[PDB]
Every structure is written in C-alpha cells, then in structure tokens.
C-alpha cells in the first residue's frame, strides 16, 4: 500500500497482538490479523508519553510529563501528595488556600526538604478583600525561594502578583532569566490577556519606588509575560463557570497566538487545560486540541495521599457522573456564586441550597417558625441564636437584618468542608466535598479494576492517563488506516 | 526511509491541505513533496478515516456525521433532502407535528431520496402513548427504516415494537436488522436499556396482539435495542448540561462492558453530540473516540432550516455567553428547563417569571401589580381572554380536569406563551420578536467565533452541507497537522488550523 516494507512469517494471537500494541517503544507493522516489530497494510511509529504536550513545559519545570495536579484548598493537596508526585517527576501544586501562614511555611520546609531540586508549586489565591494575606504569601514565597506558583481566582493583576513575578527577573550575555514562574489558572479571556501581557508600567514603577524591585527588573518585566503557563479551567470541581473544554481551550489558544505574534517573546507562552479530565480518552483529546499540558483534578482528592477523610475518599470511589451538583459557595454566598459538589452520600447540597432559598426569600431570621425549627434541628443542631453567638466569637459583626442571617448561614457553608477534610464524626450527612463529573468518568473507566478499592495513588493515576493517552493515540492512528482492531484492545484499561 | 521538494509557503499550505496525497517533509534550507523513493511523513487520510466505517456502511453515508433533529420541522424536508443528496444523514424534526404533516414529509423525502439517506425523529410521549404508537405505525407502513429515538427515560412497547418488527432471518439463519435505531441519551441508566436486548415481557405481549412473530421475539433477545447510541452532552433545547469530555467516555466504558457480556455479532456504536460547532471540537470528539459526531445548533442557522429569516439572522450574531436555561413548555410544571438564546429576545426572562409566579401562587386568582405586567407585556390580553381560546384549543383537542384544579388552569394559560413562542420564531411572526423562543447551545457561538472574517459571517451564505464539509475536512486536516507535529516537525502557526477560506 503506502508503506515501503515487507515482513516474513509476524504474530496472530490477540494476547500477542495486545502485548505488542501496548509497547510504545517499538514501532508496529500490521499485515492483513498480524502484527510484527508479506506486505504491510498499516503502520504505527514509536511514540511514548513524551510525544504528548509541550516539551518546553517539561524542560522549564523539570518534569517528566506535561501534566500537573491542580491545587486543592485547605491542604487537601497536601505535603504527602506533593512529595509523592514530586518524587516521580510530576508537578503538583500545594493547596495553600485557606491555611494560616505558619501552616504554609511549615509546608514549604517539609516540601523543600523532600524536594531540594523540585518539582513543586504553591497555590497563590486571590484574596480581593484581604489584600494583606496575599502580600504575606508572596513575601513567604520570596523569602523561602518558592520559584513556582499557580495563580488562581484573579480578576486582574495585583501589585503582589506583579511583585512576585518581577522580583524573580535577572540577567545572565545580558539575556533575561525568569526565576519566578507563574501558572495562571483562568476561565475568561479578559483575565487571560492580562497574564499573557507584560506587567503594567504603573504598578512596576510603584514597586521600584518602594525599593521592592530594581530598575533593571522594571525594564525586564516589560519584555516578558506575567505568566509562563496559562491553564484554561473548564467545567470542574469546586469553583467553576461550567464552561465547555471543547469551546474554551480553543478560544484561549487562539488568544495566545494573537498575543505571541504581537510581543514575540523569546520563550513562547503556553496554554494548558484542565476541567473534566478523568480518563485517557479526554486526556488525549485535550492534548490534540493544542494543550501544552493537562491538569487534574477531582480524581486526586480520591487518592490516599490527599488530605481528605477516609470516609470521604471512600465515598468518592463510588461517586458517579450524575452524582455532582451546584451549591452555594461560602465566600460569595450573598452574590449567588455556586460551586460543584458531590450530592451522593451527603445532604450538604440540599441543605445548603435550602439556606440560600431561605436567605433570598425572607427578610430576617425573625422566617416561619415551622421552617426555622427544621434548620436548628437538622442542619445547625443548635439555636440560630446559639450559632450567632459563636460566629461573633469567630469574628464584620449587626446593623443589617439580611447580613446577619447570611453570617449565621455561612457557619454551615464554611464548616461543612472542614468536617469532610478532618473526618468529623456524626456530621457525615453534612460533608461538603468538591468534585466534578471527571471523577465519575474515572470511576466508570476504572470499574472492575484494582482501582475500585485504598489502592488509589496519585502517581499511578497520572501514569495511566498519560500512558493511556499515548496508547490510544496509536490505536486511533491505526483505526484511521482501516485496520480492524479488536474492540477489547481499542482502549487503555487499568490491568 | 524513502529518500529526499517545495519551500513556498503557499505551496506548503496548499500541499498540506490535499488529504488525498501523502506528504513527504524535509527539514536546510521546510520542504514538502508528494513523491519519494524525508524528515516527517503524513499518509493520505481524508474525511473517511474519521469515525466508525461501519456507521457509514450501515447508513450508506459519506461521513460519520449526522444532523440531529430539530423540533416542529426546523429540521425540515429541505434540510434533509439537501444533506441526503450530499450523502449526509439528517434526522427529520417530527416532534410536535401532527400525523398528517409527518406523513406528508415522509412522501416528499422518500420521493427525493428513494434509497436514503434520512432518519425520522421518534420522540417519547410520556403524556400520550397514542402519539407515539401512531408515529411507529406511520414509519412501519411507509418503511421508514431509520429512526432517531430521543427523550426516552426507558423502553416503551412502541419503540420495542418498531425494533422487533424489522427483524428477520437470511437464508443462512443470521439475524437481519431491518429497522435501525439511533437512541439519543444523556444518562447511563437509559443507555443501558438501549444497549441491551428487548425485555421478554413486552415482547410476549406484542406477539399476543399479533404485532410481531414468535421468531421475531426470539431474534429480538439476541440483538440490542439500538445500533447507535448518541451521548448528548450540553446542547441546545432539552439538556442536563453534561460535559462532552466526561459523558462520552462514561458511555464508551459502559459500551465495552455490555459488548463483552452479550458479544453481539455487530458491535454497538457510541457517537456523540453537544457542543460541536468547530473542527477542533469535532476532532476532539472523534479522538475520544466517537463513532460519529452530531450537530447541532449550527444547523438552525442555515438557510435550509425551518426558522424565520429574523431568527436565522439573529443566530449569526449569537455568542457563547448569549444562551441560558428557561422553563420548558412540555414539562413546565415539573420544573424542567431547556437551553435558549437570550440575546435579542426577552423570552427567557419572561418564561422564568411565569414559573416563579406559577410556583408561588395558587391560582390566577389571586396573583395584580404582577398580573397587569403579564397581561400588558407578555400575553397582550387579559388572562381571562387567554383562558378562553385555550378552552377552544383543547376542546377540539379535552380542560375538564382544569376546571376542578386552578393550578392546572394557571399552568395551561402560561403554557399558551411557552408553546407559541417557538412557533413565532419558526414562522417569523411579526411584532412578537422580543418573545421568540430559540433553542441553541454554546456550540453556535463557538462556530460564529471560528467563522468570523469569512463568507460565513453572512447568514444568507450558510448551507448545512458546506458546514458539514468544513467540520469534517477541518478535523481531518488538523489530525494530519497533529500527526506531523508529533513527528517532531514545526508547522507555521498560520497553517495549523482549518479556516474557512
Ligand atoms: N475550586 C476552587 O477554586 C476552590 C474550591 C474550594 C475553595 N476554594 C478557595 O479556597 C478557600 C477555601 O476556604 P473556605 O471558603 O472553605 O473557608 P473560608 O475561611 O474562606 O470560609 C469563609 C466562611 O467561613 C465561615 N466560617 C468558617 N468558620 C467559621 C466559624 N467558626 N464560625 C462562623 N463562620 C465560620 C465564615 O462565616 C465565612 O463566611 C477559599 O479561598 C475558597 O474561596 C477554591
Ligand atoms: N432537544 C430536544 O429534545 C427538544 C427540543 C425542543 C423540543 N423538543 C420536543 O419537541 C416537541 C415540541 O413541542 P413544544 O414543547 O414546542 O410544544 P408542544 O407541542 O409540546 O405543546 C406545548 C404546550 O403548549 C401549550 N400550547 C401550545 N400551543 C398552544 C395554543 N395554540 N393555545 C394554547 N396553548 C398552547 C399547550 O399547553 C401544550 O401542551 C416537544 O415534544 C418537545 O419535547 C425536544
Ligand atoms: C476539592 C478541590 C479543591 C480545589 N481547590 C482549589 C484551590 O484552592 N485553588 C485552585 O486554583 N483550584 C482548586 N481546585 C481546582 C483544581 O486545581 C483543578 O483546577 C480542577 O479540579 C480541574 O478540574 P477537574 O476537577 O474537573 O479535573 C480544587 C479542586 C477540587 C476538586
Ligand atoms: C432548535 C433545536 C431544536 C431541536 N429539536 C430537537 C428534537 O425535537 N428532538 C431531538 O431529539 N433533538 C433536538 N435537538 C437536539 C439536536 O438534535 C442535537 O442533538 C443537539 O443540538 C446537539 O447539540 P449542539 O446543539 O450543542 O450541537 C434540537 C436542537 C436545536 C438547536
């Protein structure tokens, strides 16, 4: 046919054909039901996991895969998880969000002790109201030389994130060296533009004025982008817009090309993608869409290294595709913001949505007493007044009727995640567990495997998705050439 | 491995776009040649290499592609005949149409396409089994041998009847599937029922009513209820807003499980729709890997579609942010919602208001600061005027049940607006443009973005066959680019994507 080869009698056994196919190190010569490593009808080259993604991403972050495990709040993306993945040459971002500085600093030491030469990243979340908490974290990272952050939840540039970026700039031949790297996670084009563009001169100038950065650093900062890597986050667990991966990522890739042509950075900007990736199929499709790297995910909270209770991790292994839903978010409850949570084996969603329903419909906690009793009785397990007293002790504390109601309600929204993380007994039906459909897709893919179990390791999962993607790229390639592959061999299974 | 050409960017771009000829790439001074005795190589793989070849065989079509059904004849005879003439499968929008109308369509379409291809939408009527039975009867009578079954929550005697009746043996004793079913689903529970053989309880009853034979009942237990399973992700109209990248993989896994168990002679095929308006999305879905891809919101924007000029013109400016969820007419009381355009129309806002009022109040007595606004802006008549007229509509269907219940009366009045709103958009009813109900998903906005700065900016230049061609050709072209990129080659950014030139 199209091929310049011949072979002498190959292998004709399905379990010899299956084994040879899964070897991505050796090329495949297919003869019409025979595989070898007289004529040749189909051919598949030797393409491993390294043919997926942007090689520059791997080079720059010193990682073995174009893959990174996204941050998970309140230390769910824990030190154990980061160290486990870091030791395998896989990038993971530490879930610093919601943790106190002393806690985060502790993590920096452990992690840096375990991984002197990387790789790891730290999540730098945007605190729009508490601007100092953001400053403390940047200072903490600069002090301990944390040279990679995943910046997320940003709506615009802030002096702190610009400061972090600019401070890591230096010269070698006079070429610019980007010491501090930024992965900006976005779902909107407006925000992505600001991270693909050089830092604004106005903010730069201010930092030079305060002796935070040098003049040559201000000069350098105008010639390089704010972020090296841009993660388009599609529909996902926790906070999300629920945007489609297949529309979002292409929009951001186009945006990238536009800005790259304009500023013509020496090192190109890279766009990766996360959101809904729990199987090799999806992983491969995302790569072929143009993604430099792929991001997970809900599947990582289900692993043993994660900072989630045993009850929760066990529950996540049974969660299916339709077992997730949207529920009021604690921090942006009044504004109607929602996040994606598990709704199976937990009643938090129903109860949290009830609070929002009650909050929007009624003027004060002084609400029908038939309705009020149920809340105190089942949800809060205390008088609304008893709950209020404790909120005051925690804390914005009185003039407004609706604002008071919200603060009491937020007691449940806030705690509910803490219960799931720590494993608070007797509050299981109230666990707030963030997850997306990706987890259910993974559980479906993994059904009837060792992974049905305590047997779930983040490194193993990464390896499957990466190897699975590479294998299925080969299968697709062969199918495209009219070769008939046994249905049982077309997909990567965990076995 | 063969041995060492053109360097002209225009020649490189042109040669790359020829999927019929192989590509020999040399990196001096990249060089591309179509003859050899070689840094990178790309074989000749056209649109025929995407999808499941069996899907094309079985439906006698050029592409692993089908234009999904659009209700009330939006997927019109014109659209079906246009796509059928190009060897592309299209499903006729029978939903909501009266039998005499559907029969008319069968003739026109069968006259134009004696040997296919086409399909007819068989929608689930939970409320009235008579509408479903009449349609199955109509299809069996006129030998409509392909239906797209959608909106089903599980098996129904009618859909089982349709499937079983088309079963027969060849001289060799093998089972021949005469009537084909494409089941469109978004849940694993429902997909299982269509991937599994028909239940004997329902089968036996059909044998007892003389509808099918005993050997047909026997055959029906060794073949699946559907040949093709369309996983419908986030899409226009009715949807539960699921991600394509999680749903399709879940259904493919489910497929493999059931295939291993029953080991059908001809395997089940799982295809996918929902959010496909660009070559990028098309290729990703294939890569995932679907047997076929389905559209879509982009088809309602084409000239062949049964949508008003005002609507089609509006759809050419619709962006991804311009769609939202609104109460559905058929399932208004149950709180069901569907995805509609919210740009250039106030239907969504007004329809959501009706649901708010319906759930909060016991009867139209007593709503009247609110009541006046509805009468004033939405209905443009008194609620009483609307109630009458509705009485005339259902009297020559019974209304009798509504008198006993004020809640049922309120809903029936409200549904006057929910129902006619789509009719206005379809017909192009003047003076009610701000009330048009237009079903669409994010895929349309993605298409409009992809097509900007091209001849397709003009709605008048939008043809279903041309769109199908772009998505299929675009996907095939970009698969080649990916293949080359993976072979370590560097392709000019301007050539990496299929653009409608
Ligand atoms: N997918 C994502 O991006 C994602 C997912 C989860 C969380 N996050 C972010 O990470 C962090 C998670 O932290 P969080 O929001 O769970 O905690 P938080 O501290 O941000 O919670 C804020 C709410 O907690 C309530 N609260 C907590 N403890 C209380 C107590 N003892 N008494 C009364 N009220 C109390 C407060 O009233 C407040 O309204 C946040 O920044 C969140 O925005 C992001
Ligand atoms: N994606 C999808 O699956 C999808 C999308 C759109 C529609 N559909 C299906 O298409 C079909 C189209 O039906 P539909 O929902 O447009 O309307 P319909 O024919 O189901 O009738 C809608 C309701 O509107 C009211 N109504 C309609 N016309 C009226 C009049 N002249 N006077 C008074 N009241 C009137 C009645 O209450 C009626 O029950 C439905 O079966 C729907 O389920 C499916
Ligand atoms: C429990 C949980 C907590 C998360 N916390 C954060 C966070 O604090 N900051 C952040 O940027 N992303 C957070 N994410 C998002 C992930 O980093 C990643 O972007 C997303 O989960 C990928 O989509 P997927 O979950 O559908 O794979 C969280 C995700 C989950 C499931
Ligand atoms: C205006 C419109 C009407 C539709 N009507 C029907 C219908 O009556 N029956 C049906 O099964 N699907 C219907 N669909 C769904 C399509 O057949 C197709 O499955 C879906 O639009 C694909 O998703 P996409 O719009 O994101 O491409 C309709 C879609 C649109 C946009």
């Amino acid at each position: 046919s199209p091929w310049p080869w011949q072979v002498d009698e190959i292998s004709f056994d399905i379990e010899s054909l299956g084994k040879k196919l899964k070897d991505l190190n050796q090329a495949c010569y297919l003869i019409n039901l025979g595989i070898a490593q007289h004529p040749v009808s189909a051919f598949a080259p030797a393409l491993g996991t390294q043919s997926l993604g942007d090689s520059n991403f791997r080079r720059v972050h010193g990682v073995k895969y174009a893959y990174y495990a996204g941050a998970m709040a309140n230390g769910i993306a824990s030190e154990e998880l980061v160290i486990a993945l870091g030791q395998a040459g896989i990038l993971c971002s530490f879930g610093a969000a919601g943790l106190i500085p002393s806690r985060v600093e502790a993590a920096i030491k452990r992690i840096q002790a375990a991984l002197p030469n990387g790789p790891y990243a730290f999540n730098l979340i945007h605190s729009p109201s508490e601007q100092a908490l953001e400053r403390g974290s940047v200072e903490l990272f600069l002090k301990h030389q944390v040279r990679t952050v995943e910046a997320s939840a940003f709506l615009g540039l802030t002096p702190q994130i610009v400061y972090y970026r600019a401070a890591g700039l230096s010269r070698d031949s006079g070429e610019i060296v980007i010491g501090n790297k930024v992965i900006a996670k976005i779902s909107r084009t407006e925000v992505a533009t600001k991270f693909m563009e050089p830092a604004p001169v106005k903010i730069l100038q201010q930092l030079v004025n305060e002796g935070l950065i040098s003049e040559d650093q201000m000069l350098m900062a105008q010639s390089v982008p704010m972020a090296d890597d841009i993660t388009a986050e599609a529909d996902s667990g926790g906070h999300t817009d629920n945007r489609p991966l297949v529309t979002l990522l292409p929009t951001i890739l186009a945006l990238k090309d536009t800005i790259q042509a304009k500023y013509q950075y020496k090192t190109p900007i890279r766009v990766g993608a996360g959101g809904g990736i729990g199987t090799p199929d999806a992983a491969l499709a995302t790569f072929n869409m143009g993604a430099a790297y792929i991001v997970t995910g809900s599947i990582n909270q289900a692993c043993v290294e994660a900072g989630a209770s045993e009850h929760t991790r066990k529950l996540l292994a049974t969660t299916e595709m339709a077992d997730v839903t949207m529920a009021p978010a604690a921090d942006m409850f009044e504004m109607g913001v929602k996040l994606q949570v598990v709704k199976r084996g937990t009643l938090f969603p129903m109860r949290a949505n009830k609070l929002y329903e009650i909050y929007t419909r009624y003027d004060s906690i002084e609400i029908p007493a038939e309705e009020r009793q149920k809340l105190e009785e089942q949800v809060f397990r205390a008088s609304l007044d008893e709950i209020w007293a404790g909120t005051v002790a925690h804390f914005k504390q009185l003039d407004n009727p609706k604002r008071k109601m919200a603060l009491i309600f937020r007691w449940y929204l806030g705690l509910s995640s803490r219960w799931s993380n720590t494993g608070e007994v007797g509050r299981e039906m109230d666990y707030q567990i963030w997850a997306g459909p990706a987890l259910g897709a993974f559980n479906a893919w993994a059904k009837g495997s060792y992974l049905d179990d305590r047997e779930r390791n983040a490194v193993d999962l990464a390896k499957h998705l990466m190897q699975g993607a590479a294998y299925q790229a080969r299968i697709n390639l062969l199918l495209s050439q009219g070769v008939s592959i046994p249905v049982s061999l077309q997909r990567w299974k965990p076995l």
Side-chain angles (χ1 to χ4, degrees), chain A residues 2-5 12 17-18 21-25 27-30 32 34 36-37 39-55 57-78 80-82 84-129 131-132 134 136-149 151-187 189-265 267-345 347-362 364-366 368-369 371-372 375-377 379-382 384-395 398 401-402 405-406 408-417 419-426 428-446 448 451-466 468-494:
Chain A
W3 314 106
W5 295 298
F12 282 83
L17 166 60
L21 276 186
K22 290 185 214 322
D23 191 27
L24 310 165
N25 286 345
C28 290
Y29 304 97
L30 296 177
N32 231 318
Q37 311 196 24
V40 157
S41 65
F43 172 71
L47 302 151
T49 58
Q50 303 84 3
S51 57
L52 303 166
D54 197 334
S55 52
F57 173 92
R58 297 201 309 277
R59 218 189 55 252
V60 169
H61 299 287
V63 283
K64 286 157 188 175
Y65 309 95
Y67 178 109
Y68 88 74
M72 294 177 285
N74 289 295
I76 298 179
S78 59
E80 286 73 26
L81 184 71
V82 174
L85 285 166
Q87 278 173 346
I90 298 158
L91 185 61
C92 179
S93 75
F94 174 79
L99 293 186
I100 57 160
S102 70
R103 176 67 176 92
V104 174
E105 184 171 28
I108 295 177
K109 290 164 194 138
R110 289 197 53 193
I111 294 193
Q112 278 184 346
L115 307 161
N117 292 306
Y120 53 88
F122 275 74
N123 186 215
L124 174 54
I125 197 143
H126 180 44
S127 52
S129 55
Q131 204 73 333
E134 194 179 308
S137 290
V138 170
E139 261 162 32
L140 216 46
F141 298 157
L142 288 179
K143 176 178 156 206
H144 295 291
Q145 294 179 32
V146 173
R147 308 235 153 218
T148 310
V149 303
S152 74
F154 283 87
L155 287 138
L157 296 178
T158 67
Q160 289 74 234
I161 185 72
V162 174
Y163 171 31
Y164 177 83
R165 176 67 165 184
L169 292 176
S170 73
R171 312 221 172 235
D172 69 0
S173 312
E175 300 305 325
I176 302 183
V177 166
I178 289 151
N180 290 343
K181 306 152 210 176
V182 177
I183 303 161
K185 194 151 65 200
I186 60 88
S187 57
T189 63
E190 309 92 48
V191 184
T193 310
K194 302 194 173 194
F195 277 104
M196 290 185 209
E197 281 180 340
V201 146
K202 310 281 250 68
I203 301 190
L204 290 174
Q205 210 182 126
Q206 205 184 24
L207 306 169
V208 172
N209 204 30
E210 301 183 323
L212 289 179
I213 58 150
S214 78
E215 285 181 18
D216 192 32
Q217 276 176 334
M218 166 166 177
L219 179 296
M220 289 188 278
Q222 313 189 47
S223 189
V224 308
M226 265 302 297
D228 303 286
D229 288 291
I230 304 280
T231 306
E233 198 189 31
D235 185 277
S236 61
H239 277 112
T240 180
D241 283 356
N242 306 114
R243 303 196 176 210
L245 183 52
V246 298
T247 55
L248 175 65
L249 169 61
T251 297
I252 307 309
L253 282 173
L255 176 57
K256 186 207 84 193
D257 288 332
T258 290
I259 291 185
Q260 181 63 45
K262 197 185 183 217
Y263 293 94
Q264 290 176 340
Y265 303 114
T267 310
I269 53 177
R270 293 178 298 263
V271 177
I277 298 161
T279 67
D281 320 303
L284 177 65
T286 311
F287 274 126
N288 284 358
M289 263 208 270
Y293 55 95
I294 56 154
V295 168
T296 63
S298 302
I299 61 166
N300 288 320
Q301 193 190 197
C303 290
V304 301
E305 302 83 350
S309 69
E310 185 175 4
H311 179 269
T312 297
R313 279 181 297 107
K314 184 171 146 176
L315 183 68
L316 289 170
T318 75
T319 299
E320 292 173 18
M321 176 201 71
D323 290 342
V324 294
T325 192
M326 300 301 294
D331 36 346
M332 280 158 263
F333 168 76
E334 295 91 334
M335 325 221 81
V337 169
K338 285 156 96 74
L339 37 72
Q340 203 157 205
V341 294
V342 176
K343 75 166 162 192
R344 180 225 182 98
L347 291 157
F348 163 81
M350 296 297 296
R351 298 184 166 159
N353 276 306
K354 194 51 173 182
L355 296 184
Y356 187 74
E357 218 193 34
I358 284 158
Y359 162 82
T360 58
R361 196 176 272 277
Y362 299 102
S364 47
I365 80 178
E366 279 76 32
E371 205 79 47
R372 167 153 173 166
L375 300 174
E376 313 189 320
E377 181 147 346
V379 181
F380 294 102
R381 296 183 184 177
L384 293 175
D385 304 330
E386 189 178 340
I387 294 296
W388 183 10
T391 297
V392 165
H394 182 64
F395 293 118
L398 267 168
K402 282 254 168 157
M405 181 158 43
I408 300 173
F409 283 7
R410 299 223 263 115
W411 174 84
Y412 176 77
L413 279 298
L415 285 278
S416 55
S417 49
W419 296 329
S420 175
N421 293 0
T422 65
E424 176 84 29
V425 192
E428 288 94 355
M429 283 326 287
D430 281 316
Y431 280 13
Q432 180 177 170
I433 308 146
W434 304 304
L439 180 295
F442 168 84
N443 285 343
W445 169 80
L451 292 164
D452 271 6
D453 204 333
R454 283 176 314 177
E455 291 287 316
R456 292 187 177 189
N457 293 123
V459 175
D460 186 41
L461 296 208
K463 256 158 214 219
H464 276 312
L465 262 42
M466 290 305 298
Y471 174 71
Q472 282 184 207
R474 161 175 280 182
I475 299 297
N476 283 3
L477 208 211
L478 290 174
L479 288 178
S480 291
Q481 300 175 54
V483 191
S484 61
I485 315 282
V487 70
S488 53
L489 289 171
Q490 297 191 16
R491 296 173 72 241
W492 178 268
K493 298 298 187 173

